[PDB]
C-alpha cells in the first residue's frame, strides 16, 4: 500500500508515512525528442532533483476530435515510465490549458469551430470537449499514480486560472470533480497562481491545494505569505521558480544570472519548501508548436529559456551551480554525469529551388479549394497550423498602385502577397495593414497567410488565424475567394509528389541533399543549421519539421538539429520553404545554401 | 583488365597505362580495433592519401603451427577490402619479418623450439615454416591484387634485410621465388632499406625493386641518390618517411615537429617520388604485442608515434598541416572530415584484492607444473607471452641476507621474487642480476618471470624468454624447479575461478556501470593508475596492455568504447607486479581513474 498525502499538522508532505519535500525541474516531453528523453531525465537526476514536472498539451494528443496521438514522441505514458524507472517522482500538469509558450496554451484549435466559445469557462461546449479529453487521458494516468505503483505524486488543475478574466468557479469545480472521478480521492490535486492575492482570488478552490509561482525578482517571504493566506497549513510550494525566461522574435534573448538563480534557490530550500525549477531543460518548439503573447508577439523556435540544461541538453555553468546548491540540502547521486552531446559542423550544403508554392497547389491541396464570397478563417477551412493560400481576381485595373488593405487589422498573422506571380510584399498583423499593388484587371491576387502561433496567455487565446475580416482594394470589399488549405507536411514528405505516395521573391521550396558516412561510430552527431542570406521560413530535414527560421529578426540565428533524424549512406534531404527573399537568383549557386555549425547562436543581435 | 607496373622509361609507375604516384600512410590493422578501421581509413583518405601501407604480422595470425586467426580483429582480408571500398590502394608488407616495434618482429615464438634456429636466413627449418605460412597467406592476398580487382599494388619482400648481420641472398631469392609462385609474375615486388650503400649492400636483390627509408633529418637529395645507384631507372620511393618516432619505457616521449615533416614532405612530393608516411596512425600495442630493442629496452603499450592521427584517432595539428601540403599537388576530397571521438572521464573506480598469483595457481596452471633439474625457458615450457612462475626450495638457511643471482644475466626480462609469501624485490635484465634474500631452509623461493617483449630488431631477435641460464644462491647453482606456465588470459576472463618496498603480485578487480539508452555513451576513455607501479590491465577480459607509471613516459592507457557495456557492469582487472596501494585502512586508494585526455609524455 503506497501513500502520498499532505500532512496539514506538520506543514509537510508524507510519502509512505514519512516526511517529504521535492526539488523538481520542469521538462516538457513535447519539446525534447523521445530519442533524448532518458539523456535529459538522467542529467536531471544527477543534479539532485528527486522529481520532475511536465505539462500535457491537449492539442499535442488530440489534433482532431477523437483522433489521438500517444506513440513515439507523443507517448506520455512511456516518458512517465522512464522517469519512474530512473527513480524520479512526477508532478503532472495536464491543464487542460497549460499556457507554457505553446500554441493556444495547449488548447486544440478545433474548439474554435464554435466561434463564440468562451474558453476556460463553464461554456457547455468547452466543458463537453474537456470532459471527453479527460475520459481519454486520466484513465491512462491512473496506474501511473504513486498510490498505484507509478511516479505521479501531485496533479495540477488548470494553470494560473487566477490570471484569466473570466473567474468561473463552476469550471474549476467541474475540473475537480472529473479529475476525482478518474483518478480517485487520495491523489493530491493542486493549483498554481502568481503570488499575490489579486491572482489567488480567482485561482484558488476549496479541495485544491494552493501553490504559487515566483522567480528571482520576488521577495520570498512575501510570496510564501501570500501562499499561507490561502493555505495556512501544509507545505510551502513554488511550482515555477524561474531559472530563466521566455523570448520573442525581434527582442533580445532573455537570460537570468546564475548567481541570482542559485541564491534564491538556496533561500527557498532553506525554508523546507518544495520547489520546481521552470525550466530545467526547455528544449525546442518543433513544427508550429510555439505560442504568442498579446499584443501579438510570437515566441521563437528555441525554447532554450536560459535553462540549466541548454536547448540540446548541455550541462552549463548554471547546471553545476544549482547542483551545488542542492548538495547543501540533499544527497546527490554519485558517479559521472552523462555528457553534453558532441556537435558536428557538417558545413555548407547547396539548395535549389524546386517549385514555387503557387506551382505546388495540386500537391499541397489535393482535394481542391473552398469557395467563398468573403474570406474564411483557418478554422472554417479545417486547417489549424501552417499556411493557407487565399486567391481572388483584381476587379479593376491597377496599373497605378492601388491600396490593398485589411481595415480591421484582420491579417492574422502575416501574408505574402503576389499578383500574377509578381511578389508585392507583406501585410502584417498590427504593423502594416495596407500594401500597394499593381497588376491588370483580372490578374490573380494571392495571399499566402501564416499562422505565427496562437496566443497562449491573456484574454485573446481565441485566436482564429487567417484572413479573419475583409480585404479592401481602393476601399471596396474584395469578394469571391478561392481558399487552399496547404498540406505542407505531406507535400514535404513526398518531395512535392516526386517520391510518389507509398525586395521579395515568391514563396517557394528549396531542396538539397548531404550524405554522411556509415560505419563511423561517432556520426551522425547533433548539429545546428543556420541560414545566412535567407529571410523567413520553415525548414525540414528528411521530412522532420525543425521549425521556423527568421535571421532577419533574431535573436535566434541557428536551429537545433538532433542526430536521430539524420541518416547514413542514404542522402539527407533538406527542405526550406522561404517566404520572403531567397539568396538564389544570381548565377552564384554557392549563395543558395545553408550551413551546419557546431555552436548555437540564440543570443546575437 | 587492370595493370600496375613499373615503367623503367618514364621513371614511373603506370596504373592502367597512366603515370601514377602514391602518397600513402602506414596503418597497422593489428594495432587498431576493427571497430575503428573504417574511421581511421576514412580520415586517411580525407588527408589526400591515395594509398595505405600495412604490415602482416605472422605471429598475429599463426600463434601455434597450423592454428590460424583471420576473423574479427585478425581479419586482414576484410581490412584490405575495406580500404578498397574507400578507394584506397594498398602497399602490402607481409614480411615474414616486419620489425615494427612488434613482438619478435612478427616472427612467431614457436620458431625458437629449434634452439639454434638462425632467423631470417636460409636455415632450412626457418624456410619450411615461412613457406607453409606463405602458402596460407599469399593465396588469400592473390585476389586482392590490383591485377585481379583488388587494392594491392606493390608488395614488400622482407624488411630492411640489409640491416641484418646474416646477409643471406639465397634467403631473399627464396622469398622472391615463393611470392612469384603464389601471386604470379606481374605483381610489383620491392624491398625497403636505409638510404646508404652500407644498408643497400645486403638488402637489394635482382628482380626486387629497391626502395629506401628516411626521415626529416636526412639530406633528401643524398637519400634518393643512394636509391638511384641501385635502380638507375624507375620511380623514386621513400617507403617510410618518418612522421614521428618510437618510444621506450623509461625514456622521454619521441616527437618530431610538424614544420619539419611538412617541409620534407612537400620536398619529396615535388620530386615526383612516391612516398609513405610512417606512421599515419600508430594506434596501440594491446595485450603483449610490443617489442624491444637491444641492449634490452621494451617499447610501451602506446604506439602513438607522434603520428598525424593520435593513438585514439584524433585529428591533430600535424594532420591538418600534411593535408594542406598534399592539397598543393592533388585535389583532396570534399566534405567534412570525420571527427576525433568524444572522450569521457568515467572517474575513480575502486578495486579490491582477489588473489595473489601464489594462491591462484589452481586456475592459472590447471595442468600442474613441470619439474626440472635446472630452469627451463618460456619456449621449452610451451608459453609465448605473459608470465611464468618458477619455484624452488631454499637448500640452506638465510637468516642473514644471501645473494640470489643470475651470473650470466639470464633473467629474461624481469622477476618478481618472494620467499615464503614475502616479497624480496626484483631482478632485471641488464640492470640487477643480484638481489639479497632471507628465509629458512626448506622455504619456498618463487620467481614470477615476465616476458616484457621480444627484441624486434638486431641480432638478438632469437629471444627465448624466462630463466635462460641458472640462478645461484650463495654462489651455488639452484636446482630442482617446479615451473608453472600461467594462463593469465583464461583466468582473468573466468574471474580467477569465480566464473567457472613491495607487495606480492596479485589480481585486483572492481566494477563500473554505464547507463543504457544514452545515445552518446559509452565513449572512449583513458585509464590511469595513480599509486600503482607496474602491471597488466584488462577490461571485460580484453587485455589493454601494460602500465608502468613508475617509469613513464606513458601513464594512461587507451580504452576503446566498444569493449564497454551498459547491459551489465564492466569489470576492471589489474595484475600489479610490484606495489599495490591497497593495504592501508583507506580502501578508496585501491583504485584506478578514467580520464578524458591521454598523458603519453610524462617526464
Ligand atoms: C507576466 C505574466 C505571467 C504569464 N505566465 C507565464 S510566462 C512564463 C510561464 C509559463 O508560460 C507557464 O506555463 C505559466 O504557468 C507561467 N508563465
Ligand atoms: C636506426 C634504427 C632503425 C631500425 N628501424 C626502424 S625503427 C622504426 C622503424 C620500424 O621498426 C620499421 O618497421 C622499420 O622498417 C624501420 N624502423
Ligand atoms: C521582504 O519583506 C519582508 C517583510 O515581509 C522584509 O523583512 C524584507 O526586508 C524583504 N526583503 C526584500 C528583498 O524585499
Ligand atoms: C500607397 O500609395 C499611395 C500613393 O498612391 C501613398 O499615398 C501611400 O503612402 C502608399 N501606401 C503604402 C502602404 O506604401
Ligand atoms: C465582409 O463584408 C460584409 C460587409 O459588407 C459583411 O457582411 C461580412 O461580415 C464581412 N465578413 C468578414 C469576414 O469580415
Ligand atoms: C536528393 O535525394 C533523392 C534521391 O535519394 C532525389 O529525389 C533527389 O533527386 C536528390 N538530389 C541530389 C542532388 O542528389
Ligand atoms: C644535400 O646535398 C647536396 C649535395 O648532394 C647539397 O647541394 C644540398 O644542400 C643538400 N641538401 C640539404 C637539405 O642539406
Ligand atoms: C645485501 O646486498 C648487498 C648488495 O647486493 C651486499 O653488499 C650485502 O653484503 C648484502 N647484505 C649482507 C648481509 O652482506
Ligand atoms: C646450469 O648448470 C648446470 C651445471 O653446471 C649445467 O648442467 C647446465 O648447462 C646449466 N643450465 C642452464 C640452463 O644454464
Ligand atoms: C560489481 O562491482 C561492485 C562495485 O560497486 C561490487 O560491489 C560487486 O561485488 C560487483 N559484482 C560482481 C558480480 O562482481
Ligand atoms: Cl512544467
Ligand atoms: Cl607499414
mmCIF file of C-alpha atoms in Angstrom, chain B residues 4-171:
data_model
loop_
_atom_site.group_PDB
_atom_site.id
_atom_site.type_symbol
_atom_site.label_atom_id
_atom_site.label_comp_id
_atom_site.label_asym_id
_atom_site.label_seq_id
_atom_site.Cartn_x
_atom_site.Cartn_y
_atom_site.Cartn_z
ATOM 1 C CA UNK B 4 50.042 -1.909 -62.448
ATOM 2 C CA UNK B 5 53.708 -1.851 -63.290
ATOM 3 C CA UNK B 6 56.999 -0.018 -63.196
ATOM 4 C CA UNK B 7 57.871 1.672 -66.473
ATOM 5 C CA UNK B 8 61.634 1.945 -66.413
ATOM 6 C CA UNK B 9 61.472 4.567 -69.241
ATOM 7 C CA UNK B 10 59.397 7.408 -67.711
ATOM 8 C CA UNK B 11 60.868 6.614 -64.214
ATOM 9 C CA UNK B 12 57.381 5.916 -63.166
ATOM 10 C CA UNK B 13 54.641 3.648 -62.018
ATOM 11 C CA UNK B 14 51.861 3.147 -64.527
ATOM 12 C CA UNK B 15 48.433 2.324 -63.388
ATOM 13 C CA UNK B 16 46.217 1.170 -66.254
ATOM 14 C CA UNK B 17 48.949 2.508 -68.585
ATOM 15 C CA UNK B 18 48.927 6.018 -66.966
ATOM 16 C CA UNK B 19 51.503 7.678 -64.804
ATOM 17 C CA UNK B 20 50.840 7.157 -61.159
ATOM 18 C CA UNK B 21 52.378 8.085 -57.871
ATOM 19 C CA UNK B 22 51.394 7.348 -54.402
ATOM 20 C CA UNK B 23 51.156 9.286 -51.245
ATOM 21 C CA UNK B 24 50.495 6.661 -48.575
ATOM 22 C CA UNK B 25 50.328 6.448 -44.782
ATOM 23 C CA UNK B 26 51.054 3.470 -42.595
ATOM 24 C CA UNK B 27 48.203 1.957 -40.645
ATOM 25 C CA UNK B 28 48.622 -1.377 -38.888
ATOM 26 C CA UNK B 29 45.302 -3.246 -38.660
ATOM 27 C CA UNK B 30 46.692 -5.228 -35.705
ATOM 28 C CA UNK B 31 47.058 -2.038 -33.621
ATOM 29 C CA UNK B 32 43.618 -0.530 -34.289
ATOM 30 C CA UNK B 33 40.498 -2.358 -33.289
ATOM 31 C CA UNK B 34 38.336 -3.336 -36.212
ATOM 32 C CA UNK B 35 35.572 -1.255 -34.698
ATOM 33 C CA UNK B 36 37.550 1.806 -35.772
ATOM 34 C CA UNK B 37 39.040 0.515 -39.042
ATOM 35 C CA UNK B 38 36.752 2.500 -41.252
ATOM 36 C CA UNK B 39 37.129 5.646 -39.107
ATOM 37 C CA UNK B 40 40.913 5.627 -39.391
ATOM 38 C CA UNK B 41 40.880 4.812 -43.128
ATOM 39 C CA UNK B 42 38.322 7.441 -43.988
ATOM 40 C CA UNK B 43 40.332 10.075 -42.071
ATOM 41 C CA UNK B 44 43.377 8.897 -44.027
ATOM 42 C CA UNK B 45 41.531 9.426 -47.348
ATOM 43 C CA UNK B 46 40.377 12.939 -46.304
ATOM 44 C CA UNK B 47 44.034 13.824 -45.869
ATOM 45 C CA UNK B 48 44.558 13.211 -49.641
ATOM 46 C CA UNK B 49 46.235 9.774 -49.424
ATOM 47 C CA UNK B 50 45.573 7.578 -52.444
ATOM 48 C CA UNK B 51 47.035 4.534 -50.745
ATOM 49 C CA UNK B 52 47.715 2.955 -47.372
ATOM 50 C CA UNK B 53 50.548 0.714 -46.293
ATOM 51 C CA UNK B 54 50.453 -2.041 -43.731
ATOM 52 C CA UNK B 55 52.306 -4.958 -42.193
ATOM 53 C CA UNK B 56 51.001 -8.501 -41.832
ATOM 54 C CA UNK B 57 52.409 -9.842 -38.540
ATOM 55 C CA UNK B 58 52.817 -13.635 -38.818
ATOM 56 C CA UNK B 59 52.564 -14.165 -35.122
ATOM 57 C CA UNK B 60 49.247 -12.248 -35.045
ATOM 58 C CA UNK B 61 47.771 -14.866 -37.464
ATOM 59 C CA UNK B 62 49.555 -18.137 -36.576
ATOM 60 C CA UNK B 63 50.025 -18.288 -32.826
ATOM 61 C CA UNK B 64 50.837 -22.057 -32.999
ATOM 62 C CA UNK B 65 51.701 -24.155 -36.019
ATOM 63 C CA UNK B 66 48.606 -24.904 -38.189
ATOM 64 C CA UNK B 67 46.280 -22.739 -35.973
ATOM 65 C CA UNK B 68 45.054 -19.600 -37.800
ATOM 66 C CA UNK B 69 43.324 -16.339 -36.875
ATOM 67 C CA UNK B 70 41.707 -14.464 -39.777
ATOM 68 C CA UNK B 71 38.476 -13.392 -38.054
ATOM 69 C CA UNK B 72 37.238 -10.206 -36.396
ATOM 70 C CA UNK B 73 40.247 -8.098 -35.414
ATOM 71 C CA UNK B 74 42.624 -10.533 -37.145
ATOM 72 C CA UNK B 75 40.616 -10.259 -40.478
ATOM 73 C CA UNK B 76 43.305 -8.890 -42.768
ATOM 74 C CA UNK B 77 41.313 -9.762 -45.929
ATOM 75 C CA UNK B 78 38.489 -7.649 -44.619
ATOM 76 C CA UNK B 79 40.782 -4.785 -43.755
ATOM 77 C CA UNK B 80 42.019 -4.722 -47.359
ATOM 78 C CA UNK B 81 38.511 -4.912 -48.972
ATOM 79 C CA UNK B 82 37.551 -2.030 -46.695
ATOM 80 C CA UNK B 83 40.404 0.065 -47.919
ATOM 81 C CA UNK B 84 39.387 -0.771 -51.477
ATOM 82 C CA UNK B 85 35.732 0.213 -50.908
ATOM 83 C CA UNK B 86 37.046 3.567 -49.691
ATOM 84 C CA UNK B 87 39.020 3.947 -52.932
ATOM 85 C CA UNK B 88 42.438 3.460 -51.344
ATOM 86 C CA UNK B 89 45.164 1.378 -52.986
ATOM 87 C CA UNK B 90 47.331 -0.843 -50.798
ATOM 88 C CA UNK B 91 51.043 -1.340 -50.377
ATOM 89 C CA UNK B 92 51.302 -4.666 -48.569
ATOM 90 C CA UNK B 93 54.168 -5.610 -46.320
ATOM 91 C CA UNK B 94 53.937 -9.371 -45.475
ATOM 92 C CA UNK B 95 57.420 -9.805 -44.003
ATOM 93 C CA UNK B 96 57.818 -12.620 -42.805
ATOM 94 C CA UNK B 97 59.761 -10.370 -40.532
ATOM 95 C CA UNK B 98 58.306 -6.894 -40.297
ATOM 96 C CA UNK B 99 60.304 -5.333 -37.303
ATOM 97 C CA UNK B 100 57.614 -2.813 -36.465
ATOM 98 C CA UNK B 101 58.307 -2.320 -32.765
ATOM 99 C CA UNK B 102 56.309 -5.605 -32.516
ATOM 100 C CA UNK B 103 56.920 -8.855 -30.659
ATOM 101 C CA UNK B 104 59.925 -10.620 -32.311
ATOM 102 C CA UNK B 105 59.417 -8.540 -35.464
ATOM 103 C CA UNK B 106 56.305 -10.549 -36.266
ATOM 104 C CA UNK B 107 58.139 -13.860 -36.070
ATOM 105 C CA UNK B 108 56.244 -16.486 -34.076
ATOM 106 C CA UNK B 109 57.991 -17.593 -30.873
ATOM 107 C CA UNK B 110 57.424 -21.252 -31.654
ATOM 108 C CA UNK B 111 60.179 -20.969 -34.249
ATOM 109 C CA UNK B 112 62.503 -20.986 -31.232
ATOM 110 C CA UNK B 113 61.581 -24.649 -30.464
ATOM 111 C CA UNK B 114 64.618 -25.268 -32.652
ATOM 112 C CA UNK B 115 67.073 -23.575 -30.248
ATOM 113 C CA UNK B 116 69.786 -22.986 -32.826
ATOM 114 C CA UNK B 117 67.497 -21.525 -35.483
ATOM 115 C CA UNK B 118 69.004 -18.767 -37.494
ATOM 116 C CA UNK B 119 66.084 -16.420 -38.076
ATOM 117 C CA UNK B 120 65.922 -14.579 -41.410
ATOM 118 C CA UNK B 121 68.445 -16.854 -43.192
ATOM 119 C CA UNK B 122 68.234 -19.923 -45.447
ATOM 120 C CA UNK B 123 68.181 -22.058 -42.278
ATOM 121 C CA UNK B 124 66.031 -24.845 -43.789
ATOM 122 C CA UNK B 125 63.727 -25.089 -40.773
ATOM 123 C CA UNK B 126 63.070 -21.389 -40.858
ATOM 124 C CA UNK B 127 62.334 -21.635 -44.632
ATOM 125 C CA UNK B 128 59.925 -24.534 -44.275
ATOM 126 C CA UNK B 129 57.958 -22.655 -41.673
ATOM 127 C CA UNK B 130 57.933 -19.490 -43.792
ATOM 128 C CA UNK B 131 56.941 -21.489 -46.856
ATOM 129 C CA UNK B 132 53.956 -23.010 -45.069
ATOM 130 C CA UNK B 133 52.919 -19.536 -43.804
ATOM 131 C CA UNK B 134 53.239 -18.075 -47.343
ATOM 132 C CA UNK B 135 51.150 -20.943 -48.684
ATOM 133 C CA UNK B 136 48.341 -19.957 -46.326
ATOM 134 C CA UNK B 137 48.736 -16.126 -46.574
ATOM 135 C CA UNK B 138 49.530 -15.326 -50.190
ATOM 136 C CA UNK B 139 46.602 -17.258 -51.797
ATOM 137 C CA UNK B 140 44.476 -15.052 -49.546
ATOM 138 C CA UNK B 141 46.287 -11.978 -50.985
ATOM 139 C CA UNK B 142 46.153 -13.065 -54.627
ATOM 140 C CA UNK B 143 42.568 -11.933 -55.401
ATOM 141 C CA UNK B 144 43.279 -8.693 -53.546
ATOM 142 C CA UNK B 145 45.954 -7.758 -56.032
ATOM 143 C CA UNK B 146 45.199 -4.819 -58.281
ATOM 144 C CA UNK B 147 45.584 -7.013 -61.355
ATOM 145 C CA UNK B 148 42.651 -9.140 -60.037
ATOM 146 C CA UNK B 149 40.122 -6.497 -58.878
ATOM 147 C CA UNK B 150 41.727 -5.716 -55.518
ATOM 148 C CA UNK B 151 43.565 -2.850 -53.909
ATOM 149 C CA UNK B 152 47.111 -4.297 -53.666
ATOM 150 C CA UNK B 153 49.598 -2.502 -55.987
ATOM 151 C CA UNK B 154 53.030 -3.350 -54.606
ATOM 152 C CA UNK B 155 54.303 -5.912 -52.096
ATOM 153 C CA UNK B 156 57.395 -5.622 -49.902
ATOM 154 C CA UNK B 157 59.660 -8.714 -49.508
ATOM 155 C CA UNK B 158 61.302 -8.870 -46.073
ATOM 156 C CA UNK B 159 62.033 -5.608 -44.172
ATOM 157 C CA UNK B 160 65.416 -3.780 -44.017
ATOM 158 C CA UNK B 161 67.257 -7.044 -44.594
ATOM 159 C CA UNK B 162 70.368 -5.025 -45.282
ATOM 160 C CA UNK B 163 70.458 -4.008 -41.679
ATOM 161 C CA UNK B 164 70.626 -7.668 -40.607
ATOM 162 C CA UNK B 165 74.058 -9.274 -39.993
ATOM 163 C CA UNK B 166 73.232 -12.567 -41.824
ATOM 164 C CA UNK B 167 73.413 -11.238 -45.390
ATOM 165 C CA UNK B 168 71.951 -14.407 -46.858
ATOM 166 C CA UNK B 169 70.997 -13.735 -50.557
ATOM 167 C CA UNK B 170 69.642 -17.261 -51.046
ATOM 168 C CA UNK B 171 67.004 -16.372 -48.417
#
